[PDB]
Amino acid sequence: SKPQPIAAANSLSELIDLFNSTSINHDVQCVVASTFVHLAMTKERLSHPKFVIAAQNAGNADALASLKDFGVNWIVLGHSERRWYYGETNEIVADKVAAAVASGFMVIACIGETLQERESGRTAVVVLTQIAAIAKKLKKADWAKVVIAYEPVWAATPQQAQEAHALIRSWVSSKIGADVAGELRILYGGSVNGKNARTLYQQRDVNGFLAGLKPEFVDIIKATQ
């Protein structure tokens, strides 16, 4: 069977009212990741116990310490623009991930290739090098706290997403262990809506979504069964 799925989202007050009133029938960890300045409000307002608040991109020991102290236990790291715009390298993201885990966080670590990388058939070498860097700073036991989001930056069909996710899980199995591989949530972080979410989740190696904080996130949740 699949590990517990994750639905994570990366005007606002209307969105949280909506999430709060939503009945979610099945086992699924929901995550609302927000920017620093909206954190307190989101935390005051979001009360659905199947949801947790995540920080984003924090990389400083003291910052992580305060978030944790503030009751934030999740963080999202390495999201696409962090790498292609802000210049966070494979190693910078790796160190952020290791720092967060050491501070008691559950980490959604993002990886993904650009259009130029996908077009040239270098998806595998790129994606695996990104996670290899992440793995280098983590111990096997740390993987209990880790979640991988695959982001088709280059954008996708369920078959394409399945192939990407499957290639990630094979590298994990062989380099980290089959037991880690089996428990690891690998989320699909490409474009998704209420039409293809359900289709995508059906894929053997998709364990959820890293999608947009948007009214239709609710359908993304339902897509995880």
Side-chain angles (χ1 to χ4, degrees), residues 1-158 160-194 196-197 199-225:
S1 65
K2 277 178 179 176
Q4 177 197 50
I6 300 178
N10 200 37
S11 177
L12 225 210
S13 174
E14 265 85 23
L15 240 202
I16 301 175
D17 285 347
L18 171 63
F19 292 148
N20 283 343
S21 64
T22 302
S23 288
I24 302 163
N25 44 357
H26 65 297
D27 186 14
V28 56
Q29 184 59 256
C30 299
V31 185
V32 162
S34 85
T35 59
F36 189 58
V37 300
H38 295 309
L39 260 192
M41 186 227 80
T42 296
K43 147 167 292 305
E44 81 184 339
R45 282 283 272 101
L46 183 66
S47 63
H48 196 299
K50 289 203 182 308
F51 278 78
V52 299
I53 281 75
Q56 295 169 332
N57 302 138
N60 181 288
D62 303 315
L64 292 172
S66 335
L67 284 167
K68 183 72 184 188
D69 223 298
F70 182 70
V72 167
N73 309 129
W74 285 67
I75 186 173
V76 175
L77 294 169
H79 202 255
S80 48
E81 76 294 333
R82 305 304 307 184
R83 302 174 177 270
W84 74 254
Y85 185 80
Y86 295 95
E88 295 195 24
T89 62
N90 289 354
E91 290 67 47
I92 289 189
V93 183
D95 298 339
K96 284 195 196 185
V97 172
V101 175
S103 307
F105 281 75
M106 299 277 313
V107 187
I108 302 180
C110 309
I111 60 183
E113 86 276 24
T114 67
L115 184 62
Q116 293 53 39
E117 296 171 330
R118 156 76 52 159
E119 282 174 330
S120 57
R122 300 185 53 235
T123 305
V125 52
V126 168
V127 172
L128 298 179
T129 302
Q130 293 174 337
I131 197 177
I134 286 161
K136 186 157 171 185
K137 305 297 213 289
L138 297 167
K139 318 292 189 52
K140 172 182 182 178
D142 293 332
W143 293 81
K145 304 307 246 284
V146 167
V147 169
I148 298 294
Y150 170 70
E151 279 188 77
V153 189
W154 57 269
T157 81
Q160 288 172 311
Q162 162 56 21
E163 174 186 274
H165 283 231
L167 113 84
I168 300 162
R169 202 177 315 267
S170 265
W171 182 94
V172 174
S173 188
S174 34
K175 299 290 195 266
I176 317 294
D179 51 355
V180 171
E183 300 283 340
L184 178 63
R185 276 72 61 85
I186 308 183
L187 314 186
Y188 176 77
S191 167
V192 194
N193 51 225
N196 52 8
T199 311
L200 279 166
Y201 188 81
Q202 306 321 134
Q203 299 313 303
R204 181 188 80 188
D205 292 287
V206 177
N207 312 103
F209 300 96
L210 176 57
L213 194 51
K214 276 149 40 158
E216 56 165 2
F217 185 55
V218 176
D219 299 321
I220 295 195
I221 289 160
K222 306 188 198 305
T224 62
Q225 295 325 90

